[PDB]
Amino acid sequence: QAPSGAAMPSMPFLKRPSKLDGSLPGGEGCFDPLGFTEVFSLEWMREAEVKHCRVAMLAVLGVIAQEFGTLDFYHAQSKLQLSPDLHNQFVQNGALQQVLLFVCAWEFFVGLPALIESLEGRREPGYFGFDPLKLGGTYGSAQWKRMAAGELRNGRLAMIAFGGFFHQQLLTKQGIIEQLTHF
């Protein structure tokens, strides 16, 4: 039966959001049931999603990499990477103090100018034109869209995955790899 006009591909019973037309790389579904895009800037939301994607992806890989092996001079007492115990240690070491400085530097001198450009409509959200190896191709190609769609799908998975990582480690008090091996 379906609704009268254009229906949301991801949820065929709900009407398609006005702004989400299915054209965006990782937005074929036009998935916005709660209707955030109806009230909020899409360029803002897209910048946030892609930012969260990239932070989450590094963080999920970071946990796995740090679990397998940590550096010697960083005397890591906790084997739980998403514990308060470990976080607190590398705040006191000044390791997280250092990366906070350059993250804050990036966000103020790059991220905030980049966001403002996107709100004015002079930048695609997430674009810093960073492709040294050219594993995307020309900016706006079918290859670029496949990688852009790939970035979000990998990022969205990492975002959720990091939820699983943190919460499971908080109950079990075991490593993510340690949990997989032992039940």
Partner: protein, 151 residues
């Protein structure tokens, strides 16, 4: 409406009511075969469960039904709420339609579809009546099973 002596359709819109009836029916239909299933067969994970509508509920309230509530509530918040609000406001969606038909069991044309649509509701209503009866019977038989009810 054909049978509406109280004239509830005069106060709440039929689209909303027919969403509720079909929603209730689908819950009642899974609940009826669910009660026969759990009273017949038990999973290896639980083993020592009551297998009684009241007892099984009270047993699985903190764990299994809490998880069911969480993911059932999730669906209602994301799909159920915008669906129900869009129907009454006038989206043109049939009440009950969540576009769930992996197979081709609905039918073709209109006659066969509306028969299958009527079939769902009347199967829903009978399962709805059934589930009320099973609680009354289990309550006033000293916690007797649905199959154990037949002497």
């Amino acid at each position: 409406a054909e049978f509406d002596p109280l004239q509830i359709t005069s106060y709440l819109p039929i689209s909303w009511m027919r969403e509720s009836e079909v929603k209730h029916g689908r819950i009642a239909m899974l609940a009826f075969v669910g009660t026969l299933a759990q009273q017949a067969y038990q999973f290896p994970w639980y083993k020592g469960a009551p297998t009684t509508l009241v007892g099984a509920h009270d047993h699985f309230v903190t764990t299994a039904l809490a998880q069911i509530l969480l993911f059932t509530s999730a669906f209602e918040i994301l799909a159920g709420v915008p669906a129900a609000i869009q129907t009454v406001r006038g989206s043109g969606r049939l009440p009950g339609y969540y576009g769930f038909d992996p197979l081709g069991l609905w039918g073709k044309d209109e006659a066969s579809r509306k028969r299958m649509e009527l079939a769902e509701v009347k199967n829903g209503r009978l399962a709805m009546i059934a589930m009320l009866a099973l609680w009354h019977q289990e309550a006033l038989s000293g916690g007797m099973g649905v199959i154990e009810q037949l002497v």
